[PDB]
Design an enzyme around this catalytic site. Structure first.
Site, mmCIF file in Angstrom:
data_model
loop_
_atom_site.group_PDB
_atom_site.id
_atom_site.type_symbol
_atom_site.label_atom_id
_atom_site.label_comp_id
_atom_site.label_asym_id
_atom_site.label_seq_id
_atom_site.Cartn_x
_atom_site.Cartn_y
_atom_site.Cartn_z
ATOM 1 C CG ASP A 1 51.557 47.959 59.645
ATOM 2 O OD1 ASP A 1 50.914 46.988 59.216
ATOM 3 O OD2 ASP A 1 51.591 48.272 60.856
ATOM 4 C CG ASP B 1 48.082 46.197 63.933
ATOM 5 O OD1 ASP B 1 48.940 45.916 64.794
ATOM 6 O OD2 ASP B 1 48.377 46.271 62.725
HETATM 7 C C1 LIG Z 1 52.465 50.296 63.081
HETATM 8 S S1 LIG Z 1 50.832 49.704 63.382
HETATM 9 C C2 LIG Z 1 50.443 50.364 64.980
HETATM 10 C C3 LIG Z 1 49.853 51.757 64.835
HETATM 11 O O1 LIG Z 1 49.083 52.135 65.995
HETATM 12 C C4 LIG Z 1 48.983 53.539 65.886
HETATM 13 N N1 LIG Z 1 48.345 54.143 67.082
HETATM 14 C C5 LIG Z 1 48.888 54.329 68.292
HETATM 15 N N2 LIG Z 1 48.005 54.941 69.137
HETATM 16 C C6 LIG Z 1 46.858 55.143 68.431
HETATM 17 C C7 LIG Z 1 45.527 55.734 68.680
HETATM 18 N N3 LIG Z 1 45.196 56.250 69.899
HETATM 19 N N4 LIG Z 1 44.651 55.736 67.639
HETATM 20 C C8 LIG Z 1 44.947 55.241 66.417
HETATM 21 N N5 LIG Z 1 46.141 54.693 66.127
HETATM 22 C C9 LIG Z 1 47.106 54.615 67.072
HETATM 23 C C10 LIG Z 1 50.431 53.936 65.684
HETATM 24 O O2 LIG Z 1 50.598 55.254 65.124
HETATM 25 C C11 LIG Z 1 50.919 52.841 64.754
HETATM 26 O O3 LIG Z 1 51.016 53.336 63.425
#
Ligand SMILES: CSC[C@H]1O[C@@H](n2cnc3c(N)ncnc32)[C@H](O)[C@@H]1O
Ligand SMILES: CSC[C@H]1O[C@@H](n2cnc3c(N)ncnc32)[C@H](O)[C@@H]1O
Lengths: 281, 281
Positions: B87, B156
């Site tokens: 985001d 995050d």
């Molecule tokens: C909305 S902010 C949280 C974000 O974490 C991301 N996310 C979830 N799992 C992973 C991962 N293994 N690597 C990178 N991003 C991730 C999700 O797609 C989401 O957009």
């Protein structure tokens, strides 16, 4: 299984719900609609006019902070008044202090008290204490009539819609002030910082017109709207309520689940947006 | 009008709901179900796999604490990694520091990033910053492959059900540790203290097996389950993250809505029941 849902014009556009294991009791009392149910994950839940008042899982957060904040700042509190608080949660915490001589509770709705004695025995247990004296009365009238003055007054009210209508005005804080000892403290349930700063602003304004020091603290509690509730803190000395004068180290306070010495002061560390809104009051 | 409701096995028996003004966008991406809607009172809301990720009304609480906690403790942070965070809320806060030279973001789901650029322009604005570099990758693989080390890593993530499955294990904190400078800090989204202490216990355990100092802070945010979320704080020095080394006084931080110097340290003052559960870890 069914779900109970907390909708209100006091927090429009949001709602919190708990799955119902079983409904235990419902009634229309002289003043409000009473609902007791066992939830699937939060234990037993007390509802008044569709608003969650407590649950067994998290009530300690609210009752411990509302009580032990003023009671650790008051040096030798002897006579304490609880306004509202029919469930007995505040009384339960007040009783832990061996030095307290009297605890008056002015609760408008005796149904709440008796319901709590029946369905919430681990919360209402403090009614068995010989120091506790119950008045079934509108605290608005009680405070005009009372001849005694108090060291601590804890205003454990329901929300401004319903019988607690009379506990959220300028006149009411006059009565609180006059019913306090010249070095007396009052804490009151106050809105959530997340939903109406306006109300919080109004309360602080009423309090500041009489009290030397008016502070606001926040409590984390999942089953109140927005996951938190504030404590309007009122002092007659400029010293305020942010800093405890004692530590709760005797075996009676061994069971505390939320309150401690450090989080007392922490509760008063407010989000930037809140500090900003209340500064020129 | 209809209502959106947040049910999950991760918090059974409870649910939070927001009234829907209008649904703005829905899709099934490579990884998750995406929902954007305008709520009646909390503004626009981003949902992933039925879980609220942010709302315009309260996201600042979460993004400011997750960012400004490690960034005020790190003395001259130059290279920062955001894991997940599609985001751009964390990036938005990171960009306020003129001394930051690089901001990498490893986000698995490019749909989240582009959705945010379209529907959440005041949150994703930091993507326009020339210091920000985007990797569309599982952070689990990214952290094995990255040659650079970071001053701060901000994890995050979404919750453990979904693509963030790989970000909640022992292996993952190895990778975090190795990808940090020898005086580097990591903060991660961690459960709510009110719903699973077990998870929190497990995370702290993984972190403590590598990190010298592992702390936990709590943030008030109404639209996460139980009205709060924790920060797993990880330090390589015994000094930890509870105490800021600087104050955010330049015009870039003038707009802060939650974070300040005092509530930094306050966030680390935890309920008694929580301190008790994590002590012998
Ligand atoms: C909305 S902010 C949280 C974000 O974490 C991301 N996310 C979830 N799992 C992973 C991962 N293994 N690597 C990178 N991003 C991730 C999700 O797609 C989401 O957009
Ligand atoms: C459940 S604890 C809150 C209590 O405040 C009580 N209450 C509401 N208004 C008043 C009032 N004016 N005087 C005394 N108690 C009140 C309610 O009946 C409730 O039991």
């Amino acid at each position: 299984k069914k779900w109970f849902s907390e909708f209100s014009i006091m927090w429009p556009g949001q709602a919190f719900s708990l799955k119902i294991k079983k409904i235990l009791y419902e009634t229309k009392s002289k003043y409000q609609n009473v609902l007791v149910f066992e939830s699937t994950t939060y234990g037993k839940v007390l509802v008044l006019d569709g608003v969650i008042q407590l649950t067994e899982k998290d009530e300690f957060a609210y009752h411990e902070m509302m009580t032990h904040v003023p009671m650790t700042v008051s040096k030798e509190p002897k006579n304490v008044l609880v306004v509202g608080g029919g469930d007995g949660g505040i009384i339960r915490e007040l009783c832990k202090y061996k030095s307290v001589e009297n605890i008056d509770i002015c609760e408008i709705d005796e149904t709440v008290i008796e319901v709590s004695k029946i369905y919430f025995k681990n919360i209402s247990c403090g009614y068995e204490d010989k120091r506790v004296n119950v008045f079934i009365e509108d605290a608005s009238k009680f405070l005009e009539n009372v001849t005694n003055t108090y060291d601590v007054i804890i205003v454990d009210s329901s929300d401004p819609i319903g019988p607690a209508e009379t506990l959220f005005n300028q006149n009411f804080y006059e009565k609180i002030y006059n019913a306090l000892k010249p070095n007396g403290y009052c804490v009151a349930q106050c809105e959530s910082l997340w939903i109406h700063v306006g109300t919080i602003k109004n309360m602080i304004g009423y309090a500041k017109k009489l009290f030397k020091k008016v502070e606001y603290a926040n409590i984390s509690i999942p089953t109140y709207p927005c996951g938190c509730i504030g404590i309007l803190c009122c002092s007659k000395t400029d010293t305020g309520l942010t800093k405890p004068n004692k530590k709760l180290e005797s075996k009676e306070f061994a069971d505390l689940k939320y309150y401690n010495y450090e989080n007392h002061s922490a509760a008063f560390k407010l989000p930037a947006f809140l500090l900003k809104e209340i500064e020129n009051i």
